[PDB]
Symmetry: C3
Subunit: 195 residues, 3 copies
């Protein structure tokens, strides 16, 4: 027998699990299944992200703005902070198709590099990754995905100041898609790691 | 001397070779040179894909639908099945710029994760990766590339039921590009691996 | 304590540093901060690229063509040649957030595969990666990014004939963006490596 592709270092994956139960808030608690897989590839992190609403249509989860934003804040050790859209319970390194039972204490190797992507309140172009994507994979329902690395995705709130952060913001033309269910296609990106 | 980038584990690449001879069927046998390189990066597979028609223009390789679809079906061990667009001969792990002479018997580490991307006849958004691409790199000739992971790309045909699968479907506006030669730009994507 | 993502082989990264000082020429010396990080992932290189003008607006750095091109030429050992937009000083393998003090002498493992992407004066589709991107991440200011691998990005100039090469060309509608500052979002791509 010849087995190929049989090397997979569990500590080089940080993920929500590949098939998360409701684990994220867009507008209301647990109204979204947010899938995010981060794989460390030396000085870069290779990532795949997907989001699925589970509690209603877009009008029910948006205010007056035609956007959905999911933000992740991390402390100086790369640990997920409470002021994040994503719940911490099943955000950890890999164990099979789940997370390891012991929470990580340092994930700085997965954080966006602060020299490449500084903390700032300015919309520095390099801090963002911006692409046209499609709601439900439908060519007639375009959206813009803006990933922010550190920068404007950082929290500055008193007592909950993040060191690293990333946000995922899908935006579209005002007035459109109010009766649609929010569901994105899998999307690949990479970023420079802090270490 | 200082040599960098000099680590390349042959068993962590599964490919058509980087420069395949005609090895794929879109409409007729061997009418396409399909290049696909899968590199295992822990829990994700990093991939680059390109397609080139070698036997005629789009009108000669399409029916009444403005699309080209290339599908790969794999058994429970990740071995390529006969009901695939791609020929098996030169689909294997790497040996220089070619394939190793001994066919793999297990490539489950390169297969799309079934929990992330289930088998289904529904068009689940997460199972797909959808992007606007350009025929011949021409901005005036857009197409939509839809990559399907498991899901609707799976075969359910009696005696040829796949366990894993992926499809690549380029689609465009009906009536356009009939006299063009099908040739795509290299395209990068990643997906969550089964193990 | 449990530290994850703590493996990073310095020799598997070739970069401009994550936060380069002016190190590139678009129209005039050092008028651009060009960030490029290449990470070797077996038979593929995973890359992230960003560009920022530091000396003026687009009208000041373009002629009669609505494009910006940044080209990298490499010799047979993968060493950066003088006929490149990018300066050589801080183009090397990693040392922390900087480059190692000793210049590499061989980086063929990071070069675009010549069988996949041949040297040619024809615009072969597979040699290119072509995507719609946005100036300053603004949906109303689209551009086309065309990455060329070997192919038409190769230099053929007497005495400065490259073996490998890559170019990054952003193009847009003639007459637009003359008063804008050139600043791109981070962009991810991969390509097949020579070895």
């Amino acid at each position: 027998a010849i087995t190929i592709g049989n090397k997979n270092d569990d500590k080089l994956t940080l993920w929500t699990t590949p098939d998360p139960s409701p684990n994220c808030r867009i507008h209301s608690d647990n109204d979204c299944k947010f899938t995010l897989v981060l794989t460390k590839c030396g000085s870069q992190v290779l990532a795949t992200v997907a989001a699925l609403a589970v509690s209603g249509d877009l009008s029910s989860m948006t205010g007056t703005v035609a956007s959905v934003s999911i933000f992740l804040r991390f402390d100086q050790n790369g640990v997920l902070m409470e002021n994040s859209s994503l719940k911490k319970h099943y955000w950890n390194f890999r164990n099979g198709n789940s997370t390891n039972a012991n929470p990580y204490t340092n994930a700085v190797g997965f954080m966006p590099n602060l020299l490449a992507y500084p903390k700032t309140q300015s919309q520095t172009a390099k801090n963002n990754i911006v692409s046209q994507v499609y709601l439900h994979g439908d060519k007639t329902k375009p959206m813009i995905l803006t990933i922010t690395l550190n920068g404007t995705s950082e929290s500055t709130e008193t007592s909950e100041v993040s060191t690293y952060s990333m946000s995922f913001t899908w935006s579209w033309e005002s007035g459109k898609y109010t009766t649609e269910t929010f569901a994105t296609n899998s999307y690949t990106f990479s970023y420079i790691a802090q270490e």
